[PDB]
Amino acid sequence: DLLNKRLKLDYEEITPCLKEVTTVWEKMLSTPGRSKIKFDMEKMHSAVGQGVPRHHRGEIWKFLAEQFHLKHQFPSKQQPKDVPYKELLKQLTSQQHAILIDLGRTFPTHPYFSAQLGAGQLSLYNILKAYSLLDQEVGYCQGLSFVAGILLLHMSEEEAFKMLKFLMFDMGLRKQYRPDMIILQIQMYQLSRLLHDYHRDLYNHLEEHEIGPSLYAAPWFLTMFASQFPLGFVARVFDMIFLQGTEVIFKVALSLLGSHKPLILQHENLETIVDFIKSTLPNLGLVQMEKTINQVFEMDIAKQLQAYEVEYHVLQE
Secondary structure (H helix, E strand, O other): OOHHHHOOOOOOOOOOOOHHHHHHHHHHHOOOHHHOOOOOOOHHHHHHHHHOHHHHHHHHHHHHHHHHHOOOOOOOOOOOOOOHHHHHOOOOOOOHHHHHHHHHOOOOEEEEEEEOHHHHHHHHHHHHHHHHHHHHOOOOOOOOHHHHHHHOOOOOOOHHHHHHHHHHOHHHHHHHHHOOOHHHHHHHHHHHHHHHHOOOOHHHHHHHHOOOOOOOOOHHEEEEOOOOOHEEEEEEEEHHHHHHHOOOOHHHHHHHHHHHHHHOOOOHHHHHHHHHHHHHHHOHHHHHHHHHHHHHHHHHHHHHHHHHHHHHHHHHO
């Protein structure tokens, strides 16, 4: 019952948010008719940057989504339909097997998900089942359980489904999850170009050993870092995603790669380089995570990403 929130929110923070900013959030959250009011971008940006209290993370994300709605029309051709959560769950989904195989690997040591087909896992299962029936083109795609999982850890089951719909449709995250993997391939290309333009030396080193992003970045995009990084770090990455968009993933990837460049440069073969990026890099210390979040947060690469996309299509022909 309210122990569920306790059960769910039991994870180490990178930097505990202090007294004062908890104060500022409560005021924005308590605003009457909140969803219809546009808040000033800079206050929010300062708010997110100064800390997101764990006890309010979920409501904050929903608040940030309301703000996203107000700033982005987000049109009437690609909507998603409104068969309620409870109604979708009456049906059977063809994605049952795919959901189950990932379910067992989703935050397996977290007390809320440790019990096989326990309350936590069932709620997650149902969210994914519903989503697969809503978005049958995507159905269930590997890694999605971590995303739905992180949402579930900060709000109710049905609230998590709604936010998942919002993140996937309104924020466009669903694109990378389509079965053809085309958008995922373009994202791999974009990260590579990002490395070329911002850390040429790292780029040259990776190219020399033929290490394309697909050898290590797939989990970063598809699980949004949730499958390999600490929960506290991933939760801050999500704070930023809801405020600044899914492109934050690229920012975090670039920041991490750039940050560990000196170490990656010391490895001389595909086996050692990939192993470092896959297994060692995720073992970041508290200060490192702190620096990463702050750097990523002020990073601006939207125009470059856009350009790399056009570039991809020109080279395809």
